[PDB]
C-alpha cells in the first residue's frame, strides 16, 4: 500500500572486513539512532552473521524519512576503506 | 487604612483610567499620577489572570506562519533579490503600545 | 557602596525615588555643558554660581523630611 516515505536504506558494495561500529558511525552521519529494542539492525550474512562475513548488503533505519532521502542523495557510492558502496531504497532485497 | 475606590478616584484629576485593584497599593496617588502619562503603555492583561494567557484557548486553530509574498512572490539570480529586496511588502503591524493580550488576534 | 546606588527596589517609596531622581539629575547638570550654559542664561548667573547652587541643593532636595 505505502509506496514513498520509506525508512529502510539498503547499502550495497560493502567489504566483508567491515564491522558494526563502522556501520553505526556511517549511519550516524545522516541519523541519530534506531535502537528501538536494544540497537539497530545490521547486515544479514549466511549463518545469521556468525559464519559468513556479509552477503554484500546492509540495512539501515532512521527516525525520519527526509534524513534517509538526504543520505541516499548524498552518500551514494560512498567510499569506505575497502571500496565504493551504493545506496538504494528497496532494491528488491529485504 | 487607605483611600476608598471613590475617594482615590475623585481626588485624582484623571479617573478615566482608574483601576479597582490599583487603589490598594502602597501609594495610590503616585500610581495614578504615573498612569496618567502622555502616551505610555500600561501593564499587560496578564497581571491577575492565572491562566498564563495560553491554557484557556489552548486549542489554536490557524496556520503557524503563512509565507509572506514579500520574498516568495542556483536558487535565483535575476529574480531572487528582485522579488525579495525589490518587490517587498511592508509589514503593517501595531505602532507603539499594542501590548499582546491573551488572545489579541481573535478579537 | 556602589552595589546598586541610584535606584530602589520593589517597595521603594515615591519620595525616595524622586530624591534619587533629583540627585542623579543634577550631576547631568553640573557635568553637562548645554544644560549648564542654558541654566546660567535663564537665572543670569555665572557657571560657578549655578554650580555651587546645584551642589548645595544636593543635600536633601525635592522637599526633605530631615
Amino acid at each position: 500500500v505505502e509506496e514513498d516515505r520509506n525508512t529502510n536504506v539498503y547499502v550495497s558494495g560493502l567489504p566483508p572486513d567491515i564491522t558494526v561500529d563502522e556501520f553505526i558511525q556511517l549511519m550516524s552521519k545522516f541519523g541519530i539512532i534506531m535502537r528501538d529494542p536494544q540497537t539497530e539492525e545490521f547486515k544479514v550474512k549466511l549463518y545469521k552473521d556468525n559464519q559468513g562475513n556479509l552477503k554484500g548488503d546492509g540495512l539501515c533505519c532512521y527516525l525520519k524519512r527526509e534524513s534517509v532521502e538526504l543520505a541516499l542523495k548524498l552518500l551514494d557510492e560512498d567510499e569506505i576503506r575497502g571500496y565504493k558502496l551504493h545506496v538504494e531504497v528497496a532494491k528488491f532485497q529485504l | 487604612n487607605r483611600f476608598t475606590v471613590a475617594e482615590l478616584k475623585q481626588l485624582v484629576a484623571r479617573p478615566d483610567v482608574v483601576e479597582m485593584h490599583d487603589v490598594t497599593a502602597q501609594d495610590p496617588k503616585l500610581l495614578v499620577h504615573l498612569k496618567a502619562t502622555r502616551n505610555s503603555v500600561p501593564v499587560p492583561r496578564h497581571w491577575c489572570f492565572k491562566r498564563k494567557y495560553l491554557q484557556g484557548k489552548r486549542g489554536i486553530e490557524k496556520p503557524p506562519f503563512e509565507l509572506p509574498d514579500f520574498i516568495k512572490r542556483d536558487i535565483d539570480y535575476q529574480k531572487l533579490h528582485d522579488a525579495f529586496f525589490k518587490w517587498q511588502t511592508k509589514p503593517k503591524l501595531t505602532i507603539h503600545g499594542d501590548l499582546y493580550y491573551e488572545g489579541k488576534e481573535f478579537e | 557602596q556602589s552595589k546598586y546606588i541610584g535606584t530602589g527596589h520593589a517597595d521603594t517609596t515615591k519620595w525616595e525615588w524622586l530624591v534619587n531622581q533629583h540627585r542623579d539629575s543634577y550631576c547631568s547638570y553640573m557635568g553637562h555643558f548645554d544644560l549648564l550654559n542654558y541654566f546660567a542664561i535663564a537665572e543670569n548667573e555665572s557657571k560657578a554660581r549655578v554650580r555651587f547652587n546645584l551642589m548645595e541643593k544636593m543635600l536633601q532636595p525635592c522637599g526633605p523630611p530631615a
Binding site: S67, L74 | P68, D74 | -
Partner: protein, 145 residues
C-alpha cells in the same frame, strides 16, 4: 589531491587537522571548482562536526574554509543539506550545524538562507520550528550589520 587530502582531514591530530582545514579551504580559493559536488558535500558534512573543537584555531579555520566551500558548491544545495542535518546529530553537537547555516549567511547573500529557512517553519513540528528559531538566533547574532 582532493581525494588524497579528504581522509587527512578525518585525523584527530591538532596541528595536522588545523593545516588540513586551511589546505582544503585554499584548494577552493582561486579556481575552487576542481571537485564533484558530492565530494564537497561530504567534506562539509565531515567538517561540520569540527566547528566547535577545543582549539580555537581549528574553529576559525573551519569557518574560514566552509565559506568558500559553500560559495563554490551552491546556496540551495548547502542550505538543504544543513536543513536536513538539523534533525540528525542530536543536541550534543547539533547547534554547530546551525552555525554552519549562519556561515551560509556569512558566505552568501541574506536571501540565500532567508526564503529557504522560512519554508522550514511551515512544518507543524515542535522541535522543528524550535530548531529554526535556534538557528535564526545565531544567524542574526553573526550576520552583523
Amino acid at each position: 589531491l582532493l581525494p588524497r587530502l579528504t581522509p587527512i582531514l578525518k585525523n584527530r591530530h591538532e596541528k595536522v587537522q588545523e593545516n588540513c582545514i586551511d589546505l582544503v579551504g585554499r584548494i577552493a580559493d582561486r579556481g575552487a571548482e576542481y571537485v564533484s559536488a558530492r565530494e564537497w558535500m561530504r567534506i562539509c558534512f565531515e567538517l561540520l562536526e569540527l566547528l566547535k573543537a577545543h582549539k580555537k584555531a581549528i574553529r576559525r579555520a573551519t569557518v574560514n574554509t566552509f565559506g568558500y566551500i559553500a560559495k563554490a558548491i551552491g546556496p540551495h544545495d548547502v542550505l538543504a543539506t544543513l536543513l536536513n542535518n538539523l534533525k540528525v546529530q542530536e543536541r550534543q553537537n547539533r547547534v554547530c550545524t546551525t552555525v554552519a547555516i549562519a556561515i551560509v549567511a556569512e558566505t552568501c547573500s541574506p536571501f540565500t538562507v532567508l526564503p529557504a529557512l522560512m519554508n522550514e517553519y511551515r512544518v507543524p513540528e515542535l522541535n522543528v520550528q524550535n530548531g529554526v528559531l535556534k538557528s535564526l538566533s545565531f544567524l542574526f547574532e553573526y550576520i552583523g550589520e
